[PDB]
Design a protein around this motif. Structure first.
Motif, short mmCIF file in Angstrom:
data_model
loop_
_atom_site.label_atom_id
_atom_site.label_comp_id
_atom_site.label_asym_id
_atom_site.label_seq_id
_atom_site.Cartn_x
_atom_site.Cartn_y
_atom_site.Cartn_z
N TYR A 27 2.81 6.33 -1.69
CA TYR A 27 3.98 7.20 -1.47
C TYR A 27 5.17 6.73 -2.31
O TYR A 27 6.27 6.51 -1.79
N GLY A 28 4.98 6.49 -3.60
CA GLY A 28 5.96 5.80 -4.44
C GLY A 28 7.38 6.39 -4.47
O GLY A 28 8.35 5.64 -4.51
N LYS A 29 7.52 7.72 -4.40
CA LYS A 29 8.82 8.41 -4.41
C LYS A 29 9.61 8.28 -3.09
O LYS A 29 10.84 8.24 -3.13
N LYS A 30 8.92 8.21 -1.95
CA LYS A 30 9.50 8.31 -0.60
C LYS A 30 10.33 7.10 -0.22
O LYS A 30 9.86 5.97 -0.36
N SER A 31 11.53 7.30 0.34
CA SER A 31 12.44 6.21 0.73
C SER A 31 11.90 5.39 1.89
O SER A 31 11.58 5.93 2.94
N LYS A 32 11.83 4.07 1.73
CA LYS A 32 11.35 3.13 2.74
C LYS A 32 12.53 2.34 3.30
O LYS A 32 13.04 1.44 2.64
N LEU A 33 12.99 2.75 4.48
CA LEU A 33 14.07 2.10 5.22
C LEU A 33 13.45 1.09 6.17
O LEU A 33 12.43 1.37 6.80
N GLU A 34 14.05 -0.08 6.29
CA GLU A 34 13.37 -1.18 6.96
C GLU A 34 14.33 -1.96 7.86
O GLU A 34 15.37 -2.42 7.40
N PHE A 35 13.98 -2.08 9.14
CA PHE A 35 14.82 -2.71 10.15
C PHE A 35 14.19 -4.02 10.58
O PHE A 35 13.11 -4.06 11.17
N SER A 36 14.86 -5.11 10.26
CA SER A 36 14.30 -6.45 10.35
C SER A 36 15.06 -7.32 11.32
O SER A 36 16.24 -7.59 11.10
N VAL A 37 14.39 -7.87 12.32
CA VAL A 37 14.94 -8.97 13.11
C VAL A 37 14.74 -10.28 12.35
O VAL A 37 13.62 -10.71 12.13
N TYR A 38 15.84 -10.88 11.91
CA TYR A 38 15.95 -11.97 10.95
C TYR A 38 16.34 -13.28 11.65
O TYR A 38 17.08 -13.23 12.62
N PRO A 39 15.85 -14.46 11.22
CA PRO A 39 16.23 -15.73 11.83
C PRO A 39 17.73 -16.06 11.87
O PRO A 39 18.47 -15.81 10.91
N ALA A 40 18.17 -16.67 12.97
CA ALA A 40 19.57 -16.97 13.26
C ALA A 40 20.04 -18.33 12.70
O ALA A 40 19.22 -19.16 12.30
N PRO A 41 21.36 -18.63 12.73
CA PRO A 41 21.85 -19.97 12.44
C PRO A 41 21.27 -21.05 13.36
O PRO A 41 20.77 -22.05 12.87
N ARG A 42 21.25 -20.85 14.69
CA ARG A 42 20.83 -21.86 15.67
C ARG A 42 19.66 -21.41 16.56
O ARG A 42 18.69 -22.14 16.74
N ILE A 43 19.72 -20.18 17.09
CA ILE A 43 18.65 -19.58 17.91
C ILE A 43 17.38 -19.37 17.08
O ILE A 43 17.39 -18.75 16.03
N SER A 44 16.27 -19.89 17.58
CA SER A 44 14.96 -19.73 16.96
C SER A 44 13.88 -19.84 18.03
O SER A 44 14.08 -20.50 19.04
N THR A 45 12.73 -19.19 17.82
CA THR A 45 11.62 -19.15 18.79
C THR A 45 10.37 -19.86 18.27
O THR A 45 9.38 -19.99 18.99
N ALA A 46 10.37 -20.29 17.01
CA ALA A 46 9.24 -20.81 16.28
C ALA A 46 9.71 -21.92 15.33
O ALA A 46 10.85 -21.95 14.91
N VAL A 47 8.80 -22.83 15.02
CA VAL A 47 9.05 -23.88 14.05
C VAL A 47 8.91 -23.36 12.62
O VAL A 47 9.66 -23.75 11.73
N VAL A 48 7.99 -22.41 12.40
CA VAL A 48 7.61 -21.87 11.09
C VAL A 48 8.31 -20.55 10.70
O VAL A 48 8.02 -19.96 9.67
N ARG A 61 0.82 -1.22 0.00
CA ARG A 61 0.00 0.00 0.00
C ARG A 61 0.85 1.26 0.00
O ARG A 61 0.66 2.12 -0.85
N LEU A 62 1.83 1.37 0.90
CA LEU A 62 2.70 2.54 0.94
C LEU A 62 3.52 2.71 -0.34
O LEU A 62 3.87 3.83 -0.68
N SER A 63 3.81 1.64 -1.09
CA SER A 63 4.58 1.72 -2.33
C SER A 63 3.76 2.13 -3.56
O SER A 63 4.35 2.42 -4.59
N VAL A 64 2.43 2.17 -3.47
CA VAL A 64 1.54 2.84 -4.44
C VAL A 64 1.10 4.22 -3.93
O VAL A 64 1.06 5.16 -4.72
#
Ligand code: TA1
Ligand code: TA1
Ligand code: GTP
Ligand code: GDP
Ligand code: GDP
Ligand code: MG
Lengths: 430, 426, 426
Positions: A154-175, A149-152
């Protein structure tokens, strides 16, 4: 002028937000009730009302009530506008398809209405700062619904995104592998610079540099917010070499799809050691090239650097920085690509790093945040698409996603699109 | 009477400019308020060259200040001399150049240039006889490189016979802060070779080498680099601001300095420069000013002149000094160093001599080199450009502004044509 | 001795008026109490032009203040200079104009005009020799547009040979606060083309463009816009208030400025205007005042003069300056810009020169343009009017006041007749 709308999604994004807004309030001298005792430095992050109350340019979104009802009750209950803390009735259940197709489908047109009422209070909005978990159902599915929605809108505006990403061994979920791979279309098509972060890498930074043996999430979020304060510091403060939010991207991003930098911060240090280390500009520059300080568990020496933004803040001088990057260019273990002979974008800002008073991270005259585009990050993708492959070969949890309105073919179409990104980062190293 | 119009572009151009206005206000004895407070009639005699008279005998400098962001205007306006400039002459956007030449030249500055150029008209129409335009900018980043060369193109088309004179801070490999620096510079040098009458090539690597190996500063800032640049900016116009034994206008420099039309990429220097703790041991005199001025460590571009030959050098001296001694030293240099000057020109040195040395020194010399060694500055940018461009890296940020890939090919083509014309006279 | 009667209508006319009375009281050295406190005999010599003498040497300005609401009288009377005006000269209703021209002209102001006009008589009978009427109003909304043009009609019928001189803030598309603005203006311009001897067309879009692209104000208010308007109001009457090398009465302007009777829709400007932080760097002098004054960014209507040709320009200079230098610059402009002046007039510029510049600047120039480019201001109002009127939208609010649909048809007819007469001399 120079506004940013910060959108905090799911539990991880909201709890990082509760550390971001803890920091920004201290750094601008705003009380937790939004008032300011006694320059427009706050204007990037706070709208000011005629009462002398500074209200944050933030939206907090969760599909369940629990975490935002805690924000509505704790010390920041008086900071936020009550209708930009947004909640549903029903949890997304670590299921992408509940976030995207079924539950988030109801809250989205209310989330957009707040973002519209914030953007209409900006004058030259600089961009969006979007905080989320890759492993969550709200984190992956609702962020991917919102970004489309924001990319239609506010198409010109820069979208910076900070993501907590899955680890090599540490995980909290199966999926966690399913939700992360389904997110890869969001970051590729509807984001402009995506900062992957890893819980297991910060847990090791905490152990080795802060000497805290057993950290919580409050210790992680206090590092993740400190990086965004340093990315935004040139938007907020005076400096020798201030960096605009698009000036940043013009030096970080060599190719349209190659916008996944690593991030690191130095010095991470406790009060036990900060009085015995020199913390000279040479040392805190060199600390950013150690595998020990990367906030994703991948080794930069297994890659090549495309570009580095060294964003210094506090007491530093361009003499010292040039003399420092000259030693980094001398070291044969830190290898740049053949096509980036310049390599370094330097920013220098006169405002020191603010300490959160309850925190582990010590007072220091200097800091650098290094944000770094490198081929090495493709290994963090090669880890997780090998977790995906074991489960999708069995269709191991797929009935929960197909049962909530997703096409079964989207799993193949997402593993395919991730293999084309993992191809692109290998292709440009040569 | 030979008015100059001065224009500042981007962060670097407004920073070397806002320091230049502190230097020439000290020379002309103008207070930070704009009021005159000087010693001497000679300070007031040519104050019109850089300033407009206004009511109460307040002087308003003939600067235009251009940026695509408010934050450098805010930093200049709040600065040591910020209150001096005309509020109408601060012309600015809101969203920056993103370090993108194509944002400067085609989008963000193409919107703003209609609001810049109509202020350049108000200042040039207030002039009695305009001699030229003095533009400060950088070739890295996007505002100075791409908007400043848009503005050079617009002022060149409107004022074809006036001197266009640019001071151009430009990239080098060991002192760099931008990934796309090589692209922005290669797109910008393509405009400078066609439009400017003089371009003074300046480098942060050479300005740091002066600060460490001459001045012995422990921690040189951008404020210390901006002070070295602005000393040579004050230097080259001196002969239209003060009396002298040999007067040289910016045009009297150009006729002597530019043999073939496109070879106008100069390389400045200044003397005396002394380590701050050492001044009492040094004799200030023409042969010591010469032995500093003509030495490879003093020039403000990374090019060692021992890698080429000079076409022309101009030495613009200031102070009470002998014409025999000046003419003796400018002979002795090019006879004892004859392998470093082209031997199809029978005298390679222009001299000028002003009667008024800078405030606080008995003599000074501003050096302007034209040398085939400037090929090395254009070569290393062209090879950094080439190594990125063979893999099309970062081009979606420029082609997103509607720029062609053909314009990169044509810019690097015109860059190698400039390298070839200096290497031809080697 | 050439008294003027000044009249303020609606919110805008009373706001540009109540600022004008602060400006000319500073010039004439009159205190907010009405007492004289000035430096100079020249301030007192012509104080009768805008004021009446009263007991104790208190001066009472010859304003009439007209509104259909009490709230602007309350805002003026309580304001910085509110206590200066005669209590009897505040003439007002209770229920407003509703932003309706027909309430102004036929109902709410038709009741009130009998109480206005009999005050205009008391001031005009107190005059020794009245030269004219100076009316401030807006063409949007209902009080200034509809009552102010009723009042112009009544004063024109009663004083047919005196100068009727109006300052008229009027609509434009990008800076608008009213839905029915196009209707009110089209009904009002139909009265101005027949009755006034001069109308100075002013626009909030152009007054905001001066505030951002010249003065560099971050947050310009209506108080800052009213200050730009009132500087040009003080400007054009200067030559009947102060001595000069060339004197020009409002009639000496009209004879030179209006070639054919109806082409009197002027477009004002002012110089010097400088960014507040930049004044010390600017030289105040006739060729810089000229290069500002004749540039498209300085004029106070949205029309770029590069979209037409001037018929006549008047430049009313103030300050100690050379007649050779003024006559040189007013020649150089219309020869170097000859494509922008009509070539059936052999000199398009009137000049005037007053010996007394505004308090705090060494020189000033008020500019008055007459140009075929003013067709664009009447065209865009006429096309906004047309797009509503083809569907009869909002007409029940006007026809409810007993106005005909035929009066809208006849107003837009007379508007296109004014557009056609300027486009004829293009
Ligand atoms: C007692 C004494 O000898 O004082 C000198 C001095 O010690 C030395 C080291 C000065 C000094 O220069 C510096 O410290 C410096 C630092 C960084 C970059 C550039 C200069 C001096 O500050 C600089 C100053 O020069 C000037 O004031 C010139 O007029 C200069 N303008 C400015 O520097 C200036 C400063 C503040 C505000 C406005 C102008 C200038 C140069 C070219 C054209 C016009 C004006 C001078 C003579 C001195 C001090 C004061 C120590 C030197 O500079 C000049 C321009 O003379 C550095 O090498 C020379 C040799 C001088 O001996
Ligand atoms: C030290 C100095 O240079 O002071 C100037 C000044 O800085 C500048 C920027 C002034 C200043 O103007 C403004 O700030 C301004 C803001 C919004 C709209 C209009 C003006 C000044 O305030 C305005 C003031 O002008 C006057 O006082 C005129 O006589 C003017 N009258 C008034 O402005 C006025 C103010 C308060 C109460 C009553 C009158 C005038 C103009 C035309 C005809 C008659 C009178 C002046 C010289 C200055 C300041 C004080 C900074 C400028 O204005 C004038 C009219 O000169 C704006 O551009 C010019 C250039 C000037 O240099
Ligand atoms: N650093 C950090 N990581 C967190 C925090 N909270 C959650 N995480 C990470 O979040 C990831 C899983 O995402 P969820 O917390 O389930 O995201 P969610 O959006 O709330 O998912 P849903 O409940 O399905 O809506 C895990 O890998 C956690 O380690 C926090 O406050 N800090
Ligand atoms: N000498 C000098 N160099 C500067 C200054 N500020 C920045 N620079 C350097 O030169 C380059 C200037 O680019 P910049 O002016 O930031 O780009 P722009 O603002 O888009 O025109 C930077 O990468 C710095 O290395 C300054 O104050 N002085
Ligand atoms: N310059 C200026 N414009 C004004 C002012 N007040 C209102 N205006 C503007 O011009 C129009 C004036 O209409 P108004 O005076 O309100 O109508 P009236 O009261 O019925 O005559 C408004 O729509 C505003 O856009 C003011 O103080 N100064
Ligand atoms: Mg959740």
């Amino acid at each position: 002028m120079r506004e940013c709308i910060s959108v905090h999604v799911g539990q991880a994004g909201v709890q990082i937000g509760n550390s971001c807004w803890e920091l920004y309030c201290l750094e601008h001298g705003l009380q937790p009730d939004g008032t300011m005792p006694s320059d427009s430095s706050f204007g990037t992050f706070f709208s000011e009302t005629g009462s002398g109350k500074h209200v944050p340019r933030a939206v907090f979104v969760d599909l369940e009530q629990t975490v935002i009802g805690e924000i509505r009750n704790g010390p920041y209950r008086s900071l936020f506008h009550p209708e930009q803390l947004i909640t549903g009735k029903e949890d997304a259940a670590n299921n992408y398809a509940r976030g995207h197709y079924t539950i988030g489908k109801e809250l989205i047109d209310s989330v957009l209405d707040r973002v519209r009422k914030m953007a209409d209070q900006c004058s030259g909005l600089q961009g969006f700062l979007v905080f989320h978990s890759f492993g969550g159902g709200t984190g992956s599915g609702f962020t991917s619904l919102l970004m489309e929605r924001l990319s239609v809108d506010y198409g010109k505006k820069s979208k910076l995104e900070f993501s907590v990403y899955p680890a090599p061994r540490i995980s909290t979920a199966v999926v966690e592998p399913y939700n992360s791979i389904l997110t890869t279309h969001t970051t590729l098509e509807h984001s402009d610079c995506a900062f992957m972060v890893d819980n297991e890498a910060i847990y090791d930074i905490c152990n080795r540099n802060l000497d805290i043996e057993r950290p919580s999430y409050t210790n992680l979020n206090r590092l993740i917010a400190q990086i965004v304060s340093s990315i935004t510091a040139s938007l907020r403060f005076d400096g020798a070499l201030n960096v605009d939010l698009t000036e940043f991207q013009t030096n970080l991003v060599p190719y349209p799809r190659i916008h996944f930098p690593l991030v690191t911060y130095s010095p991470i240090i406790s009060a036990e050691k900060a009085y015995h280390e020199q913390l000279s500009v040479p040392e805190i520059t060199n600390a950013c090239f150690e595998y020990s300080n990367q906030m994703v568990k991948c080794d930069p020496r297994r890659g090549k650097y495309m570009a580095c933004c060294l964003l210094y803040r506090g007491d530093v001088v361009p003499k010292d920085v040039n003399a420092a990057i000259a030693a980094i260019k001398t070291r044969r273990s830190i290898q740049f690509v053949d096509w980036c002979p310049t390599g370094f974008k330097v920013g220098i800002n006169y405002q020191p790093p603010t300490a959160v008073p309850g925190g582990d991270v010590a007072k220091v005259l200097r800091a650098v945040c290094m944000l770094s585009n490198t081929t090495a990050i493709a290994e963090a993708w090669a880890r997780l698409d090998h977790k995906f492959d074991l489960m999708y070969s069995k269709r191991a949890f797929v009935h929960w996603y197909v049962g909530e309105g997703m096409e079964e073919g989207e799993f193949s179409e997402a593993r395919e699109d991730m293999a084309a990104l993992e191809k692109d980062y290998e292709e440009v190293g040569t | 009477m030979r008015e100059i119009v001065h224009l500042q572009a981007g962060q670097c151009g407004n920073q070397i400019g806002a320091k230049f206005w502190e230097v020439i206000s000290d020379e002309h004895g103008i207070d930070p308020t704009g009021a005159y407070h000087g010693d001497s009639d000679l300070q007031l005699e040519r104050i019109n060259v850089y300033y407009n008279e206004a009511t109460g005998g307040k002087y308003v400098p003939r600067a235009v200040l251009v940026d695509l962001e408010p934050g450098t205007m805010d930093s200049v306006r709040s600065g040591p001399f910020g209150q001096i400039f005309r509020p109408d002459n601060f012309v600015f956007g809101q969203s920056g150049a993103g370090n993108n030449w194509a944002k400067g030249h085609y989008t963000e500055g193409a919107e703003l240039v209609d609001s810049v150029l109509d202020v350049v008209r108000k200042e040039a129409e207030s002039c009695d006889c305009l001699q030229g335009f003095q533009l400060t900018h950088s070739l890295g980043g996007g505002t100075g490189s791409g908007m400043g060369t848009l503005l050079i193109s617009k002022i060149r088309e409107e004022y074809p016979d006036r001197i266009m004179n640019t001071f151009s801070v430009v990239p080098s490999p060991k002192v760099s802060d931008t990934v796309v620096e090589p692209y922005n510079a290669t797109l910008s040098v393509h405009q400078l070779v066609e439009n400017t009458d003089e371009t003074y090539c300046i480098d942060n690597e050479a300005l740091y080498d002066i600060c460490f190996r001459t001045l012995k500063l422990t921690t040189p800032t951008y404020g210390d680099l901006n002070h070295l640049v602005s000393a040579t900016m004050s230097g080259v116009t001196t002969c239209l601001r003060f009396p002298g034994q040999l007067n040289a206008d910016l045009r009297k420099l150009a006729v002597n300095m530019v043999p073939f039309p496109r070879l106008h990429f100069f390389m400045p220097g200044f003397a005396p420069l002394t380590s701050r703790g050492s001044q009492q041991y040094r004799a200030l005199t023409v042969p010591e000013l010469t032995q500093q001025m003509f030495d490879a460590k003093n020039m403000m571009a990374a090019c060692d002149p021992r890698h080429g030959r000079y076409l022309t050098v101009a030495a613009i001296f200031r102070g009470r000094m002998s014409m025999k001694e000046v003419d003796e030293q400018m002979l002795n240099v090019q006879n004892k160093n004859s392998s470093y000057f082209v031997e199809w020109i029978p005298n390679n040195v222009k001299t000028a001599v002003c009667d008024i040395p800078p405030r606080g020194l008995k003599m000074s010399a501003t050096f302007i080199g034209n040398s085939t060694a400037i090929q090395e500055l254009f070569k290393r940018i062209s090879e950094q450009f080439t190594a990125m461009f063979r893999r099309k890296a970062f081009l979606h940020w420029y082609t997103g502004e509607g720029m062609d890939e053909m314009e990169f090919t044509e810019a690097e083509s015109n860059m190698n044509d400039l390298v070839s014309e200096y290497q031809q006279y080697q």
